[PDB]
């Protein structure tokens, strides 16, 4: 009933319709009952209803207590569920109309506590379980917290047994005053209000009882419904969320302990059903781990070992007292100490042969259950009693040892597990035993365990999907003696004739994993010739996978797509690899390739720092097989990460106390501002920012500029700028940067960028201690603001280290390139990496480059010392090393300056020239520096020359290390230790070498970050553990990151990670979600206003600088296109809209050929082939565009190649004058829902964008309404001026003086392009060849 649902939507609720039919309760009931109920809650019907926006247009806007029905409640719950599944904002309707939200959520909770299998079936009951988990996990929302308020509050303890609550009030006496206060305030409540409050407080207890009973209603071996299992599973999922959230657990976990849900779980047959209850038992295991987590219930801080041990041994002592007083059989048990009974073994040896009613009496005296009356029978089994007692009193292992005992490799029981490491086809209907990383963590160990579970799950998703790659072409066969066999030919896959681990290199000091593990993979290429060229084109760093399979289908078994591929193909394990090159007959990795003889090729790869570390840990500690030997295949197109997580978990993680709660997301998140830093420097030098006093006045729109000098021609210096603490007065104190000698070439380099007041506020928040996030929209100068803030910090802080972290090569290369124009010496800048790194800057910042620059400047300084000696007229022919140069400095230059000082500073301008005794040292300089007109200025220039000589001597004192470190690596380590005050590197390099530099001498005093939206929660939590603490406190004094919460996040290998765990929520965006201040630049200079509106609507007051507003290049018309940004509909062509050659390989020849006609039209008009960028919604679409273009134009001498024909997200960090977008999708919108990727693909045009898209398909995307408003403002055809070559003098607004063509389709467009090219072929000719 797709047509039925569509007609109903277009009639009653669908957008983009003039008149809509009104809402009817019959409409909602019929839709639900006939689509969801009849087809059993269809995923595709849910998707079509979501695309029709039932919740945003139909459900809630007409919902009310009078309209509250089971169908409507279930429909809104399923809409919120599909919103969570597809990652769309869900409760915007509830935020818009919060009026009936109380009745709605109250009826939802009533439905969750209502009779199971009664009115609401188990399907709707598990739906409500997951929806309630969502309503709890969205507790940062005001109105949902408003319903959870009294229901999960401390009055939730009203559902515990009287003895347990009394003992809680006794162990915490101040809880009794709050209980009395609650009982007193309840007096003023109405009977309906009192019953509602008690029902809210007992809702969780009743739901837990209902879930435990649903579990107990499942038989052991007789088959039962999967829906009840999944309902108990989603219940445990909500339990895990409310148990891992601190203010949500604080009281609910007390009722959870009173109920012992873990006990009934581990006693039920569901936890014994290996195949039925695998994921459910895994969830229960997470719940038991978190219930035995060492976190204080009262304050939320993790407890000490002394604390948790005292708790357990005090429970043991009270149990022994209770034994002596109430169990005669347990006199010895009362005499047994902690070390005697604290183990489950002896505890059970003492409590198991007890009686059933006796153990019930024990539980009653320990306040575990209802009291056992006289001569009664306890209906709870001795099994239940003893299990509860032994789980409550038995020793538990610390989370530290538990985490350290985990081997860091994925095993064969995990590689094929979808319940924790699912696939890429996961629809999202079921749950996965997955971490949750959104807002707040109980402890740093908690957040780290979540992030480590996520990284290892990503690696297991890489060892699950690529694991079935033993030749994946025709389902590899089993052969004689169960061995492997290749049944066909494979293009992107091949069986490896062997693989030999070639190098086990030692680790760096401190880290627990080797530095380099390489393996050589030998395969005999008895396949096609062009395929062999594709194979032998191997290069450095190319991402490869070694795949292991132990296939179980015997030789010749058919293939079935909808079945689990893992078990289908018998995958074992797949680990990544990075090919450094091919090995040839000289044993050398390919670095003019030598001619390959034979078809055998061995490639040398090396995956990671810890590439062969994790499997080593597994085989050493717990007997896992050696996975580097059972692989079967090499195929092309996380162990060091888990080791860094382990470093964090095993070190005290001594973090700044101003960043602990910040990274934990809890508390007041505004305590991270330079406004909330009590250590603020009042009088600071932002010098390299302010270019003028007018600029200092303009950067302070609401501040009163109080400048201590009135003379205007004497106030534009590196002026010191003090901020207040009447209350708006910024003090401008003029200065003079002291001279550095007589050569005007030594004049310090100054910025040319007139940074706006907002960017200056960001730079100031960075130059004032604390943490900051700077929001950089497309083209507002995030890199420039980073370089400026680092400049100011180096200006006001000479000894401080600047740690510049980045995500990619372009970011750090831009940092170094922009720093190349600052008054910074080449001895303070340092660069790390992952190995090979193309120097994309002007001057070499590398390790070897640094030692070479050290040698060059040391040559220079020693030569200056020698020439200074000659200028002094000393006897001696020997040359001086830096030690002798320091000696000679202190002996003569300092001595001569002391003579000059005792002469001239204890007084003639003639003496200024008479007593400067280095005239032969200044013989190669301007005409005599001391002019003698002014004593002060002459003294300034002479002192500047002597301090120049002093700087020579100080560079020599620095270069002492280069002579004391004979090796290049040693001297570079010495520079990174002492000479480096600028350490800039990638997040991957930080996570790789974190402990290495930490034990090698790393320091961190001020840190800056770029591309903060491209590094993960764990990849951005890593840099906090870059060094060791200093005297009980961390060395980190500030961290200023620049990012964009509206752009592309880091890519998850297998999208199941962001599907279930939402790991895509980066640290930057998570801070934004907390609500932390962000210093939002909004001043663009790369896109004119018309094209910029394609991405500036999404940001906070996103604008453009006068440069973008008035650039003569900015309003220049685009040649041959009267539209500057066009979205032209691509209708059916050859019957095809969105098409699919291979599974998930979406392509559309229609929009591809429209883009082809457009790009060839650019080639035929003269638009620069560099300024033609082709982007798509699919890499399959990019490949189709490339193949058709190279098949039609190819070497057409009138046509160049479009600069980029590749992936939208893989084009991030870049831009173009023209971006040609192929929105092939017309069946489903897909991942275009992500506003991040939306702004990414929309901000790829600086002056021109040409999109071939499905207009109605795009307008049906609710997230794409602010984008489609600017998209459909133009005609849906190609509106061009064909007779207009590359240069078009017309403005973007000025009327055309040429013939205008309105092309309605790709066939006519291509025919016209071919005809114009044909007239060009008859009249003209190119000659490049």
């Amino acid at each position: 009933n797709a047509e039925f649902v569509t007609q109903l939507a277009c009639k009653y609720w669908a957008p983009h319709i003039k008149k809509k039919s009104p809402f009817d309760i019959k409409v909602i009931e019929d839709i639900y009952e006939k689509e969801i109920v009849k087809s059993r809650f269809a995923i595709r019907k849910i998707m079509l209803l979501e695309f029709s926006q039932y919740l945003e247009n139909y459900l809630w806007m007409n919902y009310s207590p009078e309209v509250s029905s089971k169908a409507y409640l279930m429909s809104i719950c399923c809409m919120v569920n599909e919103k969570f599944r597809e990652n769309v904002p869900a409760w915007e309707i509830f935020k818009k109309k919060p009026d009936h939200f109380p009745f709605f959520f109250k009826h939802i909770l009533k439905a969750a506590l209502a009779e199971t299998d009664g009115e609401f079936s188990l399907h709707e009951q598990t739906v409500l379980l997951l929806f309630l988990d969502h309503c709890f996990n969205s507790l940062e929302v005001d109105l949902i917290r408003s319903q959870v308020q009294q229901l999960i509050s401390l009055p939730m303890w009203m559902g515990l047994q009287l003895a347990r609550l009394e003992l809680e009030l006794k162990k915490t006496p101040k809880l009794r005053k709050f209980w009395n206060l609650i009982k007193k305030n309840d007096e003023k409540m109405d009977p309906e209000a009192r019953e509602q409050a008690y029902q809210e407080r007992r809702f969780l207890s009743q739901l837990i009882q209902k879930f435990i009973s649903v579990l107990k209603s499942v038989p052991l071996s007789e088959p039962v419904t999967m829906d009840k299992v999944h309902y108990c599973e989603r219940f445990i999922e909500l339990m895990i969320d409310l148990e891992a959230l601190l203010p949500t657990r604080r009281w609910f976990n007390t009722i959870l302990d009173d109920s012992h849900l873990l006990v009934h779980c581990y006693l039920s047959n569901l936890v014994r059903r290996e195949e039925d209850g695998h994921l459910f038992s895994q969830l229960l295991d997470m719940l038991k781990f978190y219930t035995g987590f060492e976190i204080n219930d009262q304050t939320g801080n993790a407890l000490t070992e002394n604390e948790m041990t005292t708790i357990h041994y005090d429970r043991i002592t009270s149990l022994q007292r209770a034994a002596f007083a109430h169990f005669p059989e347990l006199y010895d048990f009362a005499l047994s100490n902690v070390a005697e009974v604290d183990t489950r073994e002896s505890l059970v040896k003492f409590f198991g042969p007890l009686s059933s009613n006796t153990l019930h009496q024990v539980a009653s005296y320990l306040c575990l259950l209802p009291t056992l009356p006289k001569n009664e029978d306890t209906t709870f089994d001795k099994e239940f009693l003893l299990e509860l007692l032994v789980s409550r009193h038995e020793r538990r292992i610390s989370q530290i040892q538990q985490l350290n005992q985990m081997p860091l490799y994925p095993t064969e029981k995990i590689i094929w597990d979808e319940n924790i490491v699912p696939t890429e086809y996961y629809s999202g209907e079921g749950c996965l035993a997955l971490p949750k990383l959104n807002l707040q963590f109980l402890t740093l160990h908690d957040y780290l365990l979540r992030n480590f579970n996520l990284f290892r799950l990503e690696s297991t998703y890489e060892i699950r999907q690529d694991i079935e790659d033993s030749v994946s072409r025709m389902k590899p066969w089993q052969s004689e003696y169960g061995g492997v066999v290749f049944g066909g030919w494979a293009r992107m896959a091949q069986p490896i004739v062997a693989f030999t681990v070639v190098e086990v290199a030692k680790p760096n000091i401190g880290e627990n994993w080797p530095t380099r593990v390489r393996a050589d993979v030998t395969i005999n290429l008895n396949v096609r010739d062009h395929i062999k060229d594709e194979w032998e084109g191997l290069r450095k760093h190319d991402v490869c996978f070694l795949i292991t399979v132990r296939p179980t289908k015997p030789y010749g078994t058919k293939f079935d797509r909808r079945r689990p591929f893992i078990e289908q193909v018998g995958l074992v394990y797949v680990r990544g690899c990075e090919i450094q090159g091919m090995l040839d007959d000289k044993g050398r990795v390919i670095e003019p390739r030598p001619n390959l003889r034979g078809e055998s090729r061995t490639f040398r790869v090396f995956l990671d720092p810890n590439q062969y570390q994790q499997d080593m840990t597994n085989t050493i500690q717990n007997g896992a097989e050696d996975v580097y030997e059972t692989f079967n295949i090499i195929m092309r197109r996380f162990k060091a990460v888990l080791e860094t997580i382990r470093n964090l978990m095993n070190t005290d993680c001594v973090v700044p106390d101003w960043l602990h709660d910040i990274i934990l997301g809890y508390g007041d998140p505004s305590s991270a501002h330079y406004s909330k830093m009590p250590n603020q420097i009042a009088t600071l030098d932002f010098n390299d920012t302010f270019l003028s006093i007018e600029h200092l006045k303009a950067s302070f729109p609401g501040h009163n500029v109080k400048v201590t000098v009135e003379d205007p021609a004497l106030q534009i210096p590196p002026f010191r700028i003090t901020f207040p603490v009447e209350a708006k007065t910024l003090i401008v104190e003029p200065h003079v940067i002291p001279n550095r000698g007589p050569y005007p070439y030594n004049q310090p380099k100054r910025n040319t960028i007139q940074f706006t007041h907002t960017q200056i506020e960001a730079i100031r928040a960075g130059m004032q201690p604390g943490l900051t996030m700077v929001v950089g929209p497309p083209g507002t100068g995030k890199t420039d603001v980073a370089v400026q803030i680092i400049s100011n910090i180096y200006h006001n802080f000479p000894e401080q280290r600047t740690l510049i972290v980045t995500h990619s090569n372009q970011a750090l290369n831009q940092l170094f390139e922009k720093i190349m124009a600052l008054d910074i010496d080449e001895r303070h800048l340092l660069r790390l990496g992952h190995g090979e790194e193309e120097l994309e800057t002007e001057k070499d910042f590398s390790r070897y480059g640094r030692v070479n620059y050290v040698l060059a400047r040391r040559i220079e300084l020693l030569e200056e010392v020698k020439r200074l000696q000659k200028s002094l007229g000393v006897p001696g022919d020997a040359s001086y090393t830096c030690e002798t140069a320091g000696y000679f400095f202190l002996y003569q230059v300092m001595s001569r300056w002391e003579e000059y000082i005792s002469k001239v500073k204890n007084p003639d301008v003639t003496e200024v020239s008479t007593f400067f005794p280095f005239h032969e040292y200044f013989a190669n300089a301007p005409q005599p520096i001391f002019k003698g007109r002014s004593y002060e200025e002459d003294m300034e220039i002479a002192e500047g020359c002597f301090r120049h000589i002093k700087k020579i001597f100080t560079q020599l004192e620095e270069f002492r290390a280069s002579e004391l470190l004979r090796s290049g690596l040693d001297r570079s380590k010495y520079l990174l230790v002492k000479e480096a005050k600028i350490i800039a590197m990638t997040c991957t390099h930080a996570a790789l070498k974190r402990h290495d530099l930490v034990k090698l001498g790393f320091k961190y005093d001020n840190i800056l970050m770029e591309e903060a939206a491209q590094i993960l929660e764990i990849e951005t939590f890593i840099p906090l553990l870059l060094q060791n603490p200093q005297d009980g406190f961390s060395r980190l004094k500030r961290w200023i990151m620049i990012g964009d919460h509206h752009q592309l996040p880091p890519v998850i290998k297998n999208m199941a990670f962001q599907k279930y765990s939402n790991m895509e929520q980066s640290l930057f965006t998570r801070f934004v979600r907390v609500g932390v201040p962000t210093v939002d630049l909004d001043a663009q200079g790369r896109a004119r206003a018309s094209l910029c509106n394609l991405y500036n609507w999404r940001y906070k007051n996103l604008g453009n600088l006068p440069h973008v507003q008035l650039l003569p290049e900015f309003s220049t018309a685009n040649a041959g296109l009267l539209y500057d940004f066009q979205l032209i509909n691509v209708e059916d062509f050859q019957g095809v809209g969105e098409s699919e050659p291979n599974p998930y390989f979406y392509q559309n020849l229609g929009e591809a050929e429209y883009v082809v006609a457009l790009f060839m039209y650019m080639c035929l008009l003269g638009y620069p082939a560099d300024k033609i960028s082709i982007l798509t919604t699919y890499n399959g679409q990019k490949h189709l565009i490339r193949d058709i273009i190279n098949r039609r134009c190819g070497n057409n001498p009138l046509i160049g190649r479009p600069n980029k024909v590749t992936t939208v997200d893989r084009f991030q960090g870049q831009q173009n004058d023209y971006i040609l977008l192929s929105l092939v999708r017309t069946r489903a919108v897909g991942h275009l829902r992500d506003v991040r990727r939306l702004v990414v693909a929309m901000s790829r045009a600086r002056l021109g964008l040409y999109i071939f898209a499905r207009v109605s398909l795009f307008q049906n995307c609710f997230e794409l309404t602010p984008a489609f408003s600017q998209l459909t403002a133009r005609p849906l055809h190609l509106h061009i001026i064909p007779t207009e070559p590359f240069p078009t003098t017309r403005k973007n607004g000025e009327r055309p003086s040429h013939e205008v063509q309105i092309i309605k389709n790709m066939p006519q467009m291509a025919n016209f392009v071919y005809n114009m090219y044909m007239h060009l072929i008859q009249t003209t000719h190119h000659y490049h060849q």
Binding site: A339, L890, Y891, Q892, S895, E898, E899, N906
Partner: protein, 244 residues
């Protein structure tokens, strides 16, 4: 009284670099050290990173260890505890043994947190080995300033594993008698573990009498430990004692 005369004096005296003027400049900075630690600290940094001699940091340390700034003294001593090319920076003269004597002076009853003294004893034993004497003193202080519960038992077990000579079992005996009640099962089984200690003719009585006269009740275990503590060769009255 003005730094100009002293600075110019030392500067014109550093015209050459023979042994002369060192006995002026070093004590000049030493006299400048009063009312300002900055001249002594920066001059000590410049000296220890300056002209070449073994006694430069020696005079800097003699001036800086008497001071109220011990970071600068032990910092000269750290630049000495590298020495960067020269193990025997002095040879039969010891300045690292001097650092260990300073460590004992800081382990004196000033910082009694039972953390810094043991850390300084470990640092002094790590610079150069201290065998059974300072090692016995460090284990004694670590077991005595510690508690009585399983923490003292772990201290005495690790210190037994590292123990060298006799009376280390006497230190563990002191720990045990002070730990007479560490738990309610065996009542400091360390009494038995140390009464059955090393086999022939060493103590045979120390931990036994410790458990016996913590104050007194009746040990009932020390007798079994001591007469089970290697009587004479196999066939003898040994069965009679072990039976009595």
């Amino acid at each position: 009284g003005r730094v100009t005369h002293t600075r110019r004096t030392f500067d014109r005296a550093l015209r050459a670099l023979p042994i002369t003027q060192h006995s002026r400049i070093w004590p000049l900075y030493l006299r400048f050290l009063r009312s300002h630690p900055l001249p002594e600290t920066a001059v000590r940094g410049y000296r220890r990173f300056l002209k070449l001699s073994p006694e430069s940091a020696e005079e800097y340390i003699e001036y800086l260890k008497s001071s109220d700034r011990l970071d600068e003294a032990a910092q000269r001593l750290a630049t000495v505890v590298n020495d960067e090319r020269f193990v025997s920076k002095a040879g039969k003269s010891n300045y690292q043994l001097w650092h260990e004597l300073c460590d004992l002076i800081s382990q004196n009853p000033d910082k009694v947190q039972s953390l810094n003294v043991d850390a300084i004893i470990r640092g002094g034993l790590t610079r150069f080995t201290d065998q059974l004497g300072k090692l016995w003193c460090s284990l004694a202080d670590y077991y005595i300033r510690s508690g009585h519960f399983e923490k003292a038992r772990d201290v005495y077990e690790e210190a037994i594993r590292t123990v060298m000579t006799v009376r280390d079992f006497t230190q563990v005996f002191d720990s045990y008698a002070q730990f007479e009640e560490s738990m309610i099962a065996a009542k400091m089984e360390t009494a038995s573990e140390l009464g059955r200690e090393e086999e022939d003719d060493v103590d045979l009585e120390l931990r036994l009498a410790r458990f016996e006269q913590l104050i007194s009740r009746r040990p009932l275990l020390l007798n079994s430990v001591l007469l089970r503590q290697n009587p004479h060769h196999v066939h003898e009255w040994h069965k009679r004692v072990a039976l009595h």
